Amino acid sequence: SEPLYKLKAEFFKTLAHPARIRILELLVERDRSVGELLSSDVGLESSNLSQQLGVLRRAGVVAARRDGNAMIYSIAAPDIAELLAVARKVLARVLSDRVA
Amino acid sequence: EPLYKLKAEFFKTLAHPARIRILELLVERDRSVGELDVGLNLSQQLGVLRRAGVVAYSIAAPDIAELLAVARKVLARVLSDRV
C-alpha cells in the first residue's frame, strides 16, 4: 500500500515476537538492567538479548542509560505502558468470546 | 510458552497495511463489502480479522478504537523522535 501504512504494519511487526513482548512487560513493571534481563524468564543469551534490545531501541519503544559500568533499560515515555495495557485488554476479550 | 505465542499472533495479525486500513475505515463508520483505499484476496484478508476477533462487517468492540488511538499516538511520537 502506501509507505506510511508500511511503517504502521512494521510497527506492529516489531511487537509480534514472544521474547520482545516479555522484555516490554518487565520494563513496564520496573526499570531493568542488562543483567536483570539476562537473568529473567526471557531465556535469551547475551548476544541474542542485545539483538532484540537493539531492535526495540531503534523503534523508540525502549530507552537505555548508563548508571556506572552498566546499561539500565526502561520504556520510552508512558504511552508504551498504555499501549500494552489496551493490547492485552483487547486480547482478553477476544479470547474470552472465543472460548465461551 | 503458548500464552506469549498468542500475544505475538495478536500483533502479527495487525501487521498488515491492508488490514490496518480496513480497521481505520471501520472505526470511523460502518463499511460494506462494496465500499471497502485498500485496493484489493480481499475476502482472504478480511476473513483473518474475523477469526482474530476484531471484525464483526464492522468494529467488534470499542476497545479496538482506543487500541488504534494509542497506537497512532505512540507511532506519532516515535516518528517525531526517530527522524
UniProtKB/Swiss-Prot annotation, chain A:
Pfam families: HTH_5. Residues 1-95 form the HTH arsR-type domain. Induction: A member of the dormancy regulon. Induced in response to reduced oxygen tension (hypoxia), low levels of nitric oxide (NO) and carbon monoxide (CO). It is hoped that this regulon will give insight into the latent, or dormant phase of infection. The keyword DNA repair does not apply. CDD domains: HTH_ARSR. GO terms for molecular function: DNA binding; DNA-binding transcription factor activity. This is Uncharacterized HTH-type transcriptional regulator Rv0081.
